[PDB]
Amino acid sequence: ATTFYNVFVKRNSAFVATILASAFVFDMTFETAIDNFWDRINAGKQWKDIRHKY
Amino acid sequence: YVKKPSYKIVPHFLGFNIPTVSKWIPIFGIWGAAAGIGALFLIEGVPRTRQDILSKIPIIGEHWIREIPASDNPF
Amino acid sequence: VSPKTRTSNLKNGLTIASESNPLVQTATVGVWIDAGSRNENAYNNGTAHFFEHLAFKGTDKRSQHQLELDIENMGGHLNAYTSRESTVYYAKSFKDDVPKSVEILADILQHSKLAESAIDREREVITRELEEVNKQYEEVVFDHLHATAFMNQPLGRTILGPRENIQTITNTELRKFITENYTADRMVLVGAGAVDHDALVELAEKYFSHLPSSQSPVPLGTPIPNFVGSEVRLRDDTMPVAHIAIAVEGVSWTSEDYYTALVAQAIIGNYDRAVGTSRHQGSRLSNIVSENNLANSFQSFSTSYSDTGLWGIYLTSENTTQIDDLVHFTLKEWNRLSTSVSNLQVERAKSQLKAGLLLSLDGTTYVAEDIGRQLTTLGRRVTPAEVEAKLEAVTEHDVRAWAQKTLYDKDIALVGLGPIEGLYDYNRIRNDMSMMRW
Amino acid sequence: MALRKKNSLLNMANSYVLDSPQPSNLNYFWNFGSLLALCLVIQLATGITLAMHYTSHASLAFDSVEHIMRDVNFGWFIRYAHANTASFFFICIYAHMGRNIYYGSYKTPRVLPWSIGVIIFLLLIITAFMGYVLVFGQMSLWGATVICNLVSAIPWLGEDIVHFLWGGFSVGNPTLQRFFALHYLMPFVLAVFALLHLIALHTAGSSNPLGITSNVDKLSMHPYYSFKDLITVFAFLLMFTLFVFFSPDKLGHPDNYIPANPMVTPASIVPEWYLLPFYAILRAIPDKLGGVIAMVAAILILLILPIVDRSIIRGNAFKPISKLLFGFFICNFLLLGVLGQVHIEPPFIVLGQICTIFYFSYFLILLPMVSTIENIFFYIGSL
Amino acid sequence: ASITSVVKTSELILKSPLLSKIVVPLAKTYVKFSGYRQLGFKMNDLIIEETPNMQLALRRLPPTESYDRVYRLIRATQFSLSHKLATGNDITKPEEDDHYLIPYILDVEAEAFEKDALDNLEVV
Amino acid sequence: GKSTYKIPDFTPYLKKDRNTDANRLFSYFMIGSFGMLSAAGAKATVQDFLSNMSASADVLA
Ligand code: HEM
Ligand code: HEM
Ligand SMILES: CCCCCCCCCCCCO[C@@H]1O[C@H](CO)[C@@H](O[C@H]2O[C@H](CO)[C@@H](O)[C@H](O)[C@H]2O)[C@H](O)[C@H]1O
Ligand SMILES: CCCCCCCCCCCCO[C@@H]1O[C@H](CO)[C@@H](O[C@H]2O[C@H](CO)[C@@H](O)[C@H](O)[C@H]2O)[C@H](O)[C@H]1O
């Protein structure tokens, strides 16, 4: 906790760098997660689900 | 017996000197990283960013290699 | 190079410590006790200070009047003070009046009457003291500072104690206090000036030999404080000068960071517009404050106790619309102890301190106070050679590391007294404990 | 207390236009500020009116401008007023900037109003460039094409940025519609920065032609400078009248009365006259990116005047050598303007390069040297 | 540029015989063409004053010198707005063009520059 | 009621571990998360919104 504080939080430059890097990760992973979840709740309905017939 | 105090004037400019600036060099580094990450994040959507930078990153880079099937593309 | 501090013990465990100076003709002998207000609980808070009054109110032999006369006939004076962790009773006299003074001190400590009539009489005198400290603004500010920093803890209590206790302190509880606390293993007999060590040890064997020893003798200067970030505002628009103290939790006497905290304190330093040299001081805060007329004075402090301390600054200002700037610039100078200090400031502060620690001891009372303080906090007198080595060991890396764990982004205790409308709320003050640019 | 001082809103107006303490000795070159405010008001009034009749779609734009000329009551006047006042705006802004450079208005304590001023000048250029595209004549289209293609020089992302600006693969309808929206917006941004530079100035007050303090001798802005401003307002309106009513097309290019044709390229593609010096500077550097950098640097270098002027004295009234150098600098800037519209032919190619070197060397070499030497001459000469 | 700089460089030139032989006559002509004397100014009246250092030097002027400077500035402002030149006794004669302010600003700057140096001292 | 050295009761609010790094770190985690979602939200907002200026579907056709 001291270590974590000292590395990522104490210097604002480091805190902002950590926040921005986390936002980058969040953005990419959240995108993938929602895409999969959306495809499951709307299964068999979307073009991607019927495309194979054509 | 000491006749005079012992000191020198270090070079300075606009109220900065090398001892002080050297303490901040690492901080400029981290700010530079923060600015780099932030800039790259802002243009992550730009196709050239993906093509030239993001898709080349090992392991992770496949996140940005996505093709529309030719059957689904009017253009 | 000052003469060596000689140290002897008695059988009960009373320490005798002396530093002779054949160039002076006066001597300060006295008893430093490792006990004070902090040893009281909530019910008998005020007892230690109460006793100090009664110590001079008559003994089993000499009455109040006889006591007065005996000291008058000696030629010098007696003095006493009670703090949170330390009580002192000393006598300044002529060289050859030392055996008299040791005898009187031994009497007032061991054989005091504590007569119900005298308890009752002082009970009013002390009650009047409650309404007259109110004038000593620095003391008001520091007492509120301890009260809030160590909220509901023994170090947070005042020395006078509450009005309620003053009315209910009995001779029984006075006697109990001094029997539990004024034990030989907690006491140091100190002599400075024209004293012979061997003579002083003999006087100790004659007068302080029937002192009780404590059941469990711990070493001298043996103690958990939990600092509270907090503020007390005592706004008084009718006062022309604002008094502000800001502190963080500091270092104890035996901390490994003790010298590092002193160096850091010296980097900020003191300032007083009334002193001619103060406009030319090297300290950055001094320059900011003097150029902009932000303050009448400021004084950096690093107060230590056995197990904690307070490190901070005390400011006085008539500039009531720029208190914000004064506090802002002060805390931005503290930020720089974390972010910016280099060998330039550190070596300058070390130079100033190497002399300062020696200069302070310029009379027998100061020397006795130094021997007594060091013996009751550290268990030994630290030689100037050892002190010079410990100061020399402080690097700029040590100062930065200390400030980053003690100051940077930490809670403060803040006390404002007087026209402090311009002092912002806690958050805005505490937000200056870090720098967003770093 | 007078209402104009007591009421906070009235007091703000009062502080800027009425009780504002001015030096008693401002000359007529201090009148360009109010002329620029007048141009800004005329452009807002005529511009908003044109917007009520103009259609931003590329199929209708040029014809909507012809409809304004032919069918809208007094449309011809509103259109000519708007087009000519754009030129007057630049004459006044060059005069105002020339005043500022000659009299040392950029020196402390006026660095901030000067620096905000440099941004005002960049906004005016962008505003005027986008407005010129809106006609969608030949010069509109081809000027948009060549100027927007300078962005292609930005390394790595340049081409992507151009397509993003155009909203397509060449200048077309998307570009015209976005230029209309931004051309309407930019004058409001410009008015805000114009207000900002005045608020910044208010801390020191106006400088004066002698370069000394005026704190010793102040005059109220009204009535003295109100009535002195009326003289130049009426002189301006006379010049305005001569162009708008008697020669409305003198400052324009005939090719802008031909509808935009992406196929046919006009004989010579030049910017409007007020951008010509920057175009000459761009041509001087052979590299594409080099030329763009030089052209932007030619404006941003104004920001270093506070540093490179080493004089202990503000302004040129008492500095004969500085006055000669300033005269050569100004005439060189006019020659660059002329070279911006000649053909890329001998011997104008080399002349353009020499004039460009002179332009930059004023800031980087000559002004620092001359101002240093004059300091020494004042000191030695008065001993 | 600082007055200190200007004064030091000038002193280097005035020392060198060759340099002074060529620079002093130029400087005198420069001053004649500058024409500030024709508005009744002394050279030092023209120095930029909106600086902390200059405000401090002006506050240290003796009251008489300070009152006379105020009058020269007001008088010059009146000539400027009228587009007239000084005539007769209002013209500054070369012997009246004294460096009344230079010693004050040199003292202010001496302290300011020593403060900057000493803020950067390194204990050896 | 009268003495100003007797601090009012703050025990209902005081945390025992108030001076610890863990204590600060938790609050900065909340601040950091908020800054993180604000950064990711701003990025998404700016990218989607500014994309209006890129060639529209009819132009790309
Ligand atoms: C600083 C302010 C302004 C400047 C310098 C300016 C400049 C220009 C220029 C140079 C043109 C080309 C004129 C032509 O040759 O026909 C133009 C056209 C136009 N401007 Fe502005 N303008 C400004 C303010 C405004 C404002 C506020 C509007 C409000 C909408 C506006 C609306 C137009 C319109 C609709 C056109 C096209 C019709 C035409 O060409 O006349 N302008 N502008
Ligand atoms: C829309 C354009 C502008 C307007 C309406 C405007 C208006 C004014 C006005 C009213 C003043 C005070 C009166 C005067 O001295 O003329 C002034 C002063 C000033 N302006 Fe501007 N201005 C504009 C553009 C600029 C630009 C482009 C610059 C600089 C590059 C600039 C720099 C200054 C400076 C330095 C002053 C102070 C001059 C002094 O009194 O010594 N302004 N402006
Ligand atoms: C030029 C366009 C006309 C509109 C005026 C511009 C509108 C916005 C201006 C307001 C910005 C604030 O501007 C600020 O206002 C206050 C009072 O108004 C001025 O204050 C000044 O005048 C008042 C009395 O007149 C004094 O109390 C004060 O000591 C003096 O400095 C500031 O010098 C000015 O910088
Ligand atoms: C200072 C800021 C820096 C410059 C700002 C950048 C401006 C524009 C850059 C990216 C805009 C276009 O970038 C593009 O964005 C859209 C979402 O908006 C994404 O498109 C994604 O989501 C959209 C809907 O959300 C779907 O229709 C699409 O099938 C999917 O791929 C693309 O994956 C990305 O390539």
mmCIF file of N, CA and C and ligand atoms in Angstrom, chain D residues 40 43-44 47-48 50-51 54 65 79 82-83 86 89 124 127-128 131-132 134-135 180 183-184 187-188 190 272 274, ligand 1:
data_model
loop_
_atom_site.group_PDB
_atom_site.id
_atom_site.type_symbol
_atom_site.label_atom_id
_atom_site.label_comp_id
_atom_site.label_asym_id
_atom_site.label_seq_id
_atom_site.Cartn_x
_atom_site.Cartn_y
_atom_site.Cartn_z
ATOM 1 N N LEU D 40 -15.498 45.365 -37.430
ATOM 2 C CA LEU D 40 -16.077 44.168 -36.874
ATOM 3 C C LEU D 40 -17.597 44.310 -36.798
ATOM 4 N N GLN D 43 -19.012 44.004 -40.382
ATOM 5 C CA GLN D 43 -18.961 42.625 -40.842
ATOM 6 C C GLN D 43 -20.038 41.817 -40.126
ATOM 7 N N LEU D 44 -20.288 42.083 -38.843
ATOM 8 C CA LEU D 44 -21.335 41.306 -38.201
ATOM 9 C C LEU D 44 -22.685 41.654 -38.808
ATOM 10 N N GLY D 47 -22.721 40.519 -42.513
ATOM 11 C CA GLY D 47 -22.573 39.072 -42.597
ATOM 12 C C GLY D 47 -23.840 38.340 -42.153
ATOM 13 N N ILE D 48 -24.457 38.802 -41.065
ATOM 14 C CA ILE D 48 -25.666 38.128 -40.613
ATOM 15 C C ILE D 48 -26.781 38.327 -41.636
ATOM 16 N N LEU D 50 -26.311 38.761 -44.939
ATOM 17 C CA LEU D 50 -26.065 37.882 -46.077
ATOM 18 C C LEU D 50 -26.496 36.461 -45.746
ATOM 19 N N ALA D 51 -26.251 36.003 -44.513
ATOM 20 C CA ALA D 51 -26.633 34.657 -44.120
ATOM 21 C C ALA D 51 -28.141 34.463 -44.267
ATOM 22 N N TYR D 54 -28.261 33.579 -48.162
ATOM 23 C CA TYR D 54 -27.228 32.806 -48.827
ATOM 24 C C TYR D 54 -27.555 31.330 -48.661
ATOM 25 N N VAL D 65 -25.530 33.937 -54.265
ATOM 26 C CA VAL D 65 -24.833 35.207 -54.228
ATOM 27 C C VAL D 65 -25.298 36.093 -55.384
ATOM 28 N N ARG D 79 -23.682 43.084 -50.051
ATOM 29 C CA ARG D 79 -22.626 42.195 -50.489
ATOM 30 C C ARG D 79 -21.338 42.990 -50.698
ATOM 31 N N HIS D 82 -19.779 43.989 -47.468
ATOM 32 C CA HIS D 82 -19.140 42.904 -46.752
ATOM 33 C C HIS D 82 -17.797 42.557 -47.375
ATOM 34 N N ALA D 83 -17.725 42.515 -48.705
ATOM 35 C CA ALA D 83 -16.513 42.122 -49.408
ATOM 36 C C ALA D 83 -15.422 43.187 -49.282
ATOM 37 N N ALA D 86 -14.037 43.527 -45.680
ATOM 38 C CA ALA D 86 -12.980 42.565 -45.400
ATOM 39 C C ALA D 86 -11.592 43.122 -45.739
ATOM 40 N N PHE D 89 -10.682 45.870 -43.163
ATOM 41 C CA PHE D 89 -10.331 45.242 -41.907
ATOM 42 C C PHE D 89 -8.832 44.948 -41.920
ATOM 43 N N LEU D 124 -8.413 36.316 -37.679
ATOM 44 C CA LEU D 124 -8.930 37.124 -38.769
ATOM 45 C C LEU D 124 -8.574 36.480 -40.109
ATOM 46 N N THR D 127 -10.896 33.467 -40.597
ATOM 47 C CA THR D 127 -12.230 33.952 -40.877
ATOM 48 C C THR D 127 -12.313 34.390 -42.331
ATOM 49 N N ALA D 128 -11.388 35.248 -42.778
ATOM 50 C CA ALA D 128 -11.468 35.805 -44.123
ATOM 51 C C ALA D 128 -11.282 34.716 -45.176
ATOM 52 N N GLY D 131 -14.500 32.790 -45.494
ATOM 53 C CA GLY D 131 -15.581 33.558 -46.083
ATOM 54 C C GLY D 131 -15.403 33.635 -47.594
ATOM 55 N N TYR D 132 -14.157 33.720 -48.052
ATOM 56 C CA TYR D 132 -13.918 33.841 -49.475
ATOM 57 C C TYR D 132 -14.334 32.571 -50.212
ATOM 58 N N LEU D 134 -16.910 30.916 -49.683
ATOM 59 C CA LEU D 134 -18.353 30.738 -49.680
ATOM 60 C C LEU D 134 -18.983 31.136 -51.005
ATOM 61 N N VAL D 135 -18.309 31.983 -51.778
ATOM 62 C CA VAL D 135 -18.854 32.424 -53.043
ATOM 63 C C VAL D 135 -18.919 31.241 -53.999
ATOM 64 N N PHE D 180 -19.204 27.470 -44.185
ATOM 65 C CA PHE D 180 -20.213 28.450 -43.837
ATOM 66 C C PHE D 180 -20.429 28.494 -42.326
ATOM 67 N N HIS D 183 -17.381 30.031 -40.705
ATOM 68 C CA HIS D 183 -17.232 31.433 -41.018
ATOM 69 C C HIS D 183 -18.209 32.255 -40.189
ATOM 70 N N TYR D 184 -19.411 31.738 -39.940
ATOM 71 C CA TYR D 184 -20.363 32.435 -39.094
ATOM 72 C C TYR D 184 -19.833 32.476 -37.657
ATOM 73 N N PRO D 187 -16.058 35.038 -36.362
ATOM 74 C CA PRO D 187 -16.180 36.423 -35.907
ATOM 75 C C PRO D 187 -16.605 36.593 -34.455
ATOM 76 N N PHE D 188 -17.390 35.661 -33.906
ATOM 77 C CA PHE D 188 -17.748 35.774 -32.502
ATOM 78 C C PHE D 188 -16.554 35.430 -31.632
ATOM 79 N N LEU D 190 -13.510 35.896 -32.529
ATOM 80 C CA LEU D 190 -12.645 37.040 -32.728
ATOM 81 C C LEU D 190 -13.059 38.194 -31.813
ATOM 82 N N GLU D 272 -6.278 36.301 -51.621
ATOM 83 C CA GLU D 272 -6.585 37.718 -51.522
ATOM 84 C C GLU D 272 -5.348 38.515 -51.108
ATOM 85 N N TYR D 274 -4.361 40.563 -48.970
ATOM 86 C CA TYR D 274 -3.841 40.700 -47.617
ATOM 87 C C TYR D 274 -3.107 39.445 -47.160
HETATM 88 C C1 HEM G 1 -14.364 39.458 -39.280
HETATM 89 C C2 HEM G 1 -15.557 39.316 -39.799
HETATM 90 C C3 HEM G 1 -15.674 38.854 -41.186
HETATM 91 C C4 HEM G 1 -14.785 38.876 -42.243
HETATM 92 C C5 HEM G 1 -13.323 39.383 -42.298
HETATM 93 C C6 HEM G 1 -15.513 38.290 -43.321
HETATM 94 C C7 HEM G 1 -14.942 38.084 -44.569
HETATM 95 C C8 HEM G 1 -15.657 37.584 -45.645
HETATM 96 C C9 HEM G 1 -15.143 37.529 -46.955
HETATM 97 C C10 HEM G 1 -13.764 37.986 -47.377
HETATM 98 C C11 HEM G 1 -16.111 36.997 -47.750
HETATM 99 C C12 HEM G 1 -15.963 36.839 -49.239
HETATM 100 C C13 HEM G 1 -16.803 38.022 -49.788
HETATM 101 C C14 HEM G 1 -17.034 38.008 -51.283
HETATM 102 O O1 HEM G 1 -16.053 38.191 -52.037
HETATM 103 O O2 HEM G 1 -18.165 37.861 -51.828
HETATM 104 C C15 HEM G 1 -17.264 36.734 -46.942
HETATM 105 C C16 HEM G 1 -18.418 36.146 -47.443
HETATM 106 C C17 HEM G 1 -19.466 35.909 -46.544
HETATM 107 N N1 HEM G 1 -19.534 36.176 -45.205
HETATM 108 FE FE1 HEM G 1 -18.210 37.015 -44.132
HETATM 109 N N2 HEM G 1 -16.741 37.921 -42.931
HETATM 110 C C18 HEM G 1 -16.900 38.206 -41.645
HETATM 111 C C19 HEM G 1 -18.024 38.080 -40.837
HETATM 112 C C20 HEM G 1 -19.163 37.392 -41.251
HETATM 113 C C21 HEM G 1 -20.219 37.032 -40.397
HETATM 114 C C22 HEM G 1 -20.342 37.354 -38.924
HETATM 115 C C23 HEM G 1 -21.158 36.379 -41.123
HETATM 116 C C24 HEM G 1 -22.392 35.880 -40.493
HETATM 117 C C25 HEM G 1 -22.863 34.856 -41.148
HETATM 118 C C26 HEM G 1 -20.656 36.290 -42.458
HETATM 119 C C27 HEM G 1 -21.321 35.755 -43.527
HETATM 120 C C28 HEM G 1 -20.743 35.729 -44.808
HETATM 121 C C29 HEM G 1 -21.500 35.148 -45.956
HETATM 122 C C30 HEM G 1 -22.894 34.517 -45.939
HETATM 123 C C31 HEM G 1 -20.681 35.240 -47.035
HETATM 124 C C32 HEM G 1 -20.944 34.737 -48.455
HETATM 125 C C33 HEM G 1 -21.795 35.654 -49.317
HETATM 126 C C34 HEM G 1 -20.839 36.634 -49.961
HETATM 127 O O3 HEM G 1 -19.797 36.320 -50.589
HETATM 128 O O4 HEM G 1 -21.079 37.827 -49.815
HETATM 129 N N3 HEM G 1 -19.438 36.925 -42.481
HETATM 130 N N4 HEM G 1 -16.934 37.086 -45.641
#
